[PDB]
Amino acid sequence: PRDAFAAGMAIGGSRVHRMIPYDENFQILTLPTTSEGKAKVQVGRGIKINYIYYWSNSFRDPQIENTSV
DNA sequence: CGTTGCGGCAAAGTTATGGGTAAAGTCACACGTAGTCACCATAATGAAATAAGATCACTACTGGGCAGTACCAGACTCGAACTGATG
Numbered sequence: 001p002r003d004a005f006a007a008g009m010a011i012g013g014s015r016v017h018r019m020i021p022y023d024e025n026f027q028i029l030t031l032p033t034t035s036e037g038k039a040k041v042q043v044g045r046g047i048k049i050n051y052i053y054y055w056s057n058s059f060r061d062p063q064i065e066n067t068s069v
Numbered sequence: 070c071g072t073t074g075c076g077g078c079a080a081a082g083t084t085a086t087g088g089g090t091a092a093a094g095t096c097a098c099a100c101g102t103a104g105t106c107a108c109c110a111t112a113a114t115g116a117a118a119t120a121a122g123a124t125c126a127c128t129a130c131t132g133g134g135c136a137g138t139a140c141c142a143g144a145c146t147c148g149a150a151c152t153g154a155t156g
Contacts, residue, residue, distance in 0.1 A: 034092090034093095035092090036092095036093080039093080040093075040094070042094080042095095048092080048093055048094075049093095050092080051092075051093085
């Protein structure tokens with residue numbers, strides 16, 4: 001398979017326009033989502049994903065508490 | 070004969086209902102709930118008092134007997150004297 005891949009890339013070139021920088025933005029571009037797609041912002045704890053409470057200071061806003069995000 | 074509308078048949082499509090399973094929520098652990106007057110009938114004495122009872126003192130009324138007196142004899146006892154038998 002490696003020799004065939006090398007020969008095929010030699011015939012077909014590199015096609016640098018398809019190059020993608022493996023940065024953090026791409027990482028966020030390839031993340032999944034839970035089944036519900038939202039979560040409830042508990043006071044002081046955060047949002048529950050797979051029994052783990054993820055926290056961000058943006059949750060401190062009064063109108064975002066207990067709201068579906 | 071061909072076309073067109075109508076109706077039976079049986080999957081197929083849509084709601085509903087009672088099950089199972091992971092996963093987002095939910096909430097108490099944070100020293101604490103028991104606690105306190107108000108209430109009027111019943112026992113239960115202890116005191117207050119009884120209503121009758123008990124006794125003193127006085128006033129008046131009415132039975133009623135004892136120490137002493139007195140007579141009229143009958144009857145036994147005996148001074149004093151008479152009188153007869155006797156050793």
